[PDB]
Ligand binder design. Structure first.
Ligand SMILES: C[C@H]1CO[C@H](c2ccccc2Cl)CN1
Length: 164
């Protein structure tokens, strides 16, 4: 069913996360973590304190799809187990902010062709697939986008609900 999913998404905030490569999304799906550059780190920490649920919707650049979505379970923190992210050639792990813990809500893909009817008022009413990494997605658009994903029957949202 979709009822527990709708409960988790009620009054949530939503952010578009754009990844350079599938390997980092796979790492995030396996380890339940994400890390971003400091400008987006500050935005996500502010959002985590502001709303009952903060949802990250992931898309790998050039894939034509979203790869799933997850809920922040923590603000960012430093000093944990290091994460072997794939970095751009000139970059170092020291440029990153902290690590956010995340709980996956759906690890299934959604092609952009299925979201063409959804536009984001916070990005000039452009199709929701369009946006820089960290772009906030307005509540109604974000809720409908998450509801378009195929159900992920491997995930039990009972555990997600207890952290709220
Ligand atoms: C999952 C993380 C992995 O590191 C990326 C990065 C690190 C340092 C400089 C530039 C970038 Cl894009 C961002 N996404």
């Amino acid at each position: 069913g979709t009822s527990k999913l709708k409960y988790v998404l009620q009054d949530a905030r939503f952010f578009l996360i754009k990844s350079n490569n599938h390997e980092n999304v796979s790492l995030a799906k396996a380890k339940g973590v994400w890390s971003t550059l400091p400008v987006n780190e500050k935005k996500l920490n502010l959002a985590f304190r502001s709303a009952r649920s903060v949802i990250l919707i992931f898309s790998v650049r050039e894939s034509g799809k979203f790869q799933g979505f997850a809920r922040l379970s923590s603000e960012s923190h430093h000093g944990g187990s290091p994460i072997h992210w794939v970095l751009p050639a000139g970059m170092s792990a020291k440029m990153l902010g902290g690590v956010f813990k995340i709980d996956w809500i759906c690890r299934r893909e959604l092609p952009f062709t299925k979201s063409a009817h959804l536009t984001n008022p916070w990005n000039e009413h452009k199709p929701v697939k369009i946006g820089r990494d960290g772009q906030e997605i307005e509540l109604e658009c974000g809720t409908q986008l998450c509801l378009l994903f195929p159900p992920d029957e491997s995930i039990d949202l009972y555990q997600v609900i207890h952290k709220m």
